[PDB]
TrEMBL record, chain A:
The gene is L3. This is Hexon protein. It comes from the Viruses. It is found in: Host nucleus; Virion. Belongs to the adenoviridae hexon protein family. The chain holds residues 248 to 296 of 933 of the full protein.
Length: 49, 46
């Protein structure tokens, strides 16, 4: 799905996309590396992660 | 002074940087003779 963005500082009356991101779920794997630091036990997508 | 201060604290008062907390819930300040340690810092870029 596409996600559109404008500057946080843009005028609300003249909003239009400056960036579009094509967002997707994929089958993400790490066949040959492992996590050596994360902040806690949670492995969900999150700001800290 | 010039440099950087890498050890993040819970707070800073006249007793120095608070590094932790008691089982009595009271602040634990750095022991100045060895804390804060120059080798320690935030563990991620974020």
């Amino acid at each position: 799905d596409m996600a559109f963005f404008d500057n946080r500082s843009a005028a609300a009356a003249g909003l239009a996309p400056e960036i579009v991101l094509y967002t997707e779920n994929v089958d993400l794997e790490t066949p040959d590396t492992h996590i050596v630091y994360k902040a806690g036990t949670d492995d969900s997508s999150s700001s800290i992660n | 002074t010039y440099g950087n201060a890498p050890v993040q604290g819970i707070n800073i008062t006249k007793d120095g940087i608070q590094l932790g907390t008691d089982t009595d819930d009271q602040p634990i300040y750095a022991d100045k003779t060895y804390q804060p340690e120059p080798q320690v810092g935030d563990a991620e870029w974020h």
